[PDB]
């Protein structure tokens, strides 16, 4: 298992990174510090997570301690939906850079294909409970992302939560300057993403699997929802390897040539979750885990189902 995957800009992206959604500001600094100590080099961030300042504190400390240098880190962030207007993209990226205390990102993603009404609220809703969209489109937002590469603010650009037709839109764009390097999508045994992964990989786009543990901390979880970490069939695979269920769930996407970004703020779990380069899942294990697909999404953006660019009406 090589620890990095080559992107279309010649850079190498660590296949195991630390997620930071719902890592509270009061805990994320320690989380990132520990992660860096134990070998994480890739950190997945976003302005919408409201903790980039505190991620930045951790990175700054570890740079100053001489634990890592900047070139060894792979820092990812994402353009939030309220900043899809071409005139807002650079300022949104620069806010992220200022909070992270960095002068470039290794990768900057369009967080969702859906643009929302610009304003202070991250999720502007109307009386029907539906999001208020913006008059933005994928191709113009992409052109604004491209300018960030041209200006040296980001080394690579990509997308997140795009369906294959939305990816195709960018790929077919007249005058395209940079292909998306990465599509970051939800992926785990209950949402195995065979078709979208095959599509992206065939196009030279690296896939990053988010919510690989099934995001048990997600805010809209219901008591009846499937729970991957507690699935006894996965516990059984883990026991056979003398590993934890999380370790199996992290190794699974790695063996599909995906990048994976498990989130924790708990130091012991951060360290444990990285110990996935000392075992292999068998063909039977992989097949069994793939067979658990139920097309069950934890991140279905249910307030956005009427947005013109909602990604999940399409099969993939
Ligand atoms: N692009 C997008 O739209 C999008 C959407 C969702 C997620 N993401 C990215 O993907 C990252 C990962 O997804 P996620 O945060 O949704 O969920 P996840 O990584 O599937 O699961 C995170 C949860 O698992 C717990 N956990 C972590 N390690 C564990 C272990 N060894 N044993 C037991 N529980 C463990 C964490 O608890 P503690 O933290 O309390 O230890 C947390 O509650 C996010 O943080 C974010 O960076 C992106």
CB 275 within 8 A of CB 170: no
Resolution expressed in Å: 1.3
CB-count burial class (<10 Å; 0-12, 13-18, 19+) for 83: buried
Cα separation, 158 vs 13, in Å, equals: 13
Cα separation, 169 vs 138, in Å, equals: 8
Nearest alpha carbon to residue 16 among 36, 280, 8: 36
Cα separation, 315 vs 89, in Å, equals: 30
Q: Mark whether 199 is an active-site residue.
A: no
Cα separation, 289 vs 276, in Å, equals: 17
43 is in an annotated binding site: no
What is the number of the ligand 1 atom nearest to the C-alpha of 270? Answer: 28
CB 266 within 8 A of CB 260: no
User: Ligand 1 mean position to 220 CA, how many Å?
Assistant: 14
Helix axes 194-202, 164-171, angle to 10 degrees: 10
Question: Is the Cβ atom of 246 under 6 angstroms away from ligand 1?
Answer: yes
Cα separation, 89 vs 303, in Å, equals: 23
Cα separation, 221 vs 298, in Å, equals: 8
249 is in an annotated binding site: yes
Question: Of the residues 49, 190, 199, 210, which is catalytic?
Answer: 49
CB 259 within 8 A of CB 13: yes
119 is in an annotated binding site: no
239 is in an annotated binding site: yes
Nearest alpha carbon to residue 275 among 237, 242, 226, 232: 242
- Method in brief: X-ray
Question: Is the Cβ atom of 299 under 6 angstroms away from ligand 1?
Answer: yes
Does residue 77 sit in helix, strand or coil?
A: strand
Alpha helices in the chain (DSSP H): 25-38, 52-64, 86-100, 138-150, 164-171, 194-202, 232-241, 245-254, 267-274, 283-290
What is the number of the ligand 1 atom nearest to the C-alpha of 228? Answer: 20
Q: Domain boundaries in the chain?
A: 1-316
- The secondary structure of 170-199 as a DSSP string is HHT-TT--S--SEEEEE-BTTB--HHHHHH
Question: Is the Cβ atom of 51 under 6 angstroms away from ligand 1?
Answer: no
Q: For the chain, what percentages of helix, strand and coil (3-state, to nearest 5) are there?
A: 40, 15, 45
Q: How distant, in Å, are the alpha carbons of 28, 123, 127, 310 from that of 130? A: 31, 10, 7, 12
User: Ligand 1 mean position to 105 CA, how many Å?
Assistant: 22
- What one-character DSSP code corresponds to residue 228? S
Cα separation, 43 vs 34, in Å, equals: 12
């Amino acid at each position: 298992m090589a620890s990095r995957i080559l992107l279309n800009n010649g850079a190498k992206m660590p296949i195991l990174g630390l997620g930071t959604w719902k890592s509270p500001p009061g805990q994320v600094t320690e989380a990132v510090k520990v992660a860096i100590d134990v070998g994480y080099r890739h950190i997945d961030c976003a302005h919408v997570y409201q903790n980039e300042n505190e991620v930045g504190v951790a990175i700054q400390e570890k740079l100053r301690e001489q634990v890592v240098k900047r070139e060894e880190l792979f820092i990812v962030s994402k353009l939030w939906c309220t900043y899809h207007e071409k005139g807002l993209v650079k300022g949104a990226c620069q806010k992220t850079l200022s909070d992270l205390k960095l002068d470039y990102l290794d990768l900057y993603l369009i967080h969702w294909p859906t643009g929302f009404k610009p304003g202070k609220e991250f999720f502007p809703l109307d009386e029907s409970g539906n999001v208020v969209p913006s008059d933005t489109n994928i191709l113009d937002t992409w052109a604004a992302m491209e300018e960030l590469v041209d200006e040296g603010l980001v080394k690579a650009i990509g997308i997140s939560n795009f369906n294959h037709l939305q990816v195709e839109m960018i790929l077919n764009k007249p005058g395209l300057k940079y292909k998306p390097a990465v599509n970051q999508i939800e992926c785990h045994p209950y949402l195995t993403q065979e078709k979208l992964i095959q599509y992206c990989q065939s196009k030279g786009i690296v896939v990053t699997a988010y919510s690989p543990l099934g995001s048990p901390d997600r805010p809209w979880a219901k008591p009846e929802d499937p729970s991957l970490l507690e699935d006894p069939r996965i516990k059984a695979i883990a026991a056979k390897h003398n590993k934890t269920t999380a370790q199996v769930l992290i190794r699974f996407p790695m063996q599909r040539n995906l990048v994976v970004i498990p989130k924790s703020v708990t130091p012991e779990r951060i360290a444990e979750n990285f110990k996935v380069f000392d075992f292999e899942l068998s063909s039977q294990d992989m097949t069994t885990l793939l067979s658990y697909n139920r097309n069950w999404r934890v991140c279905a953006a249910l307030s956005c189902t009427s947005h013109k660019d909602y990604p999940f009406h399409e099969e993939f």
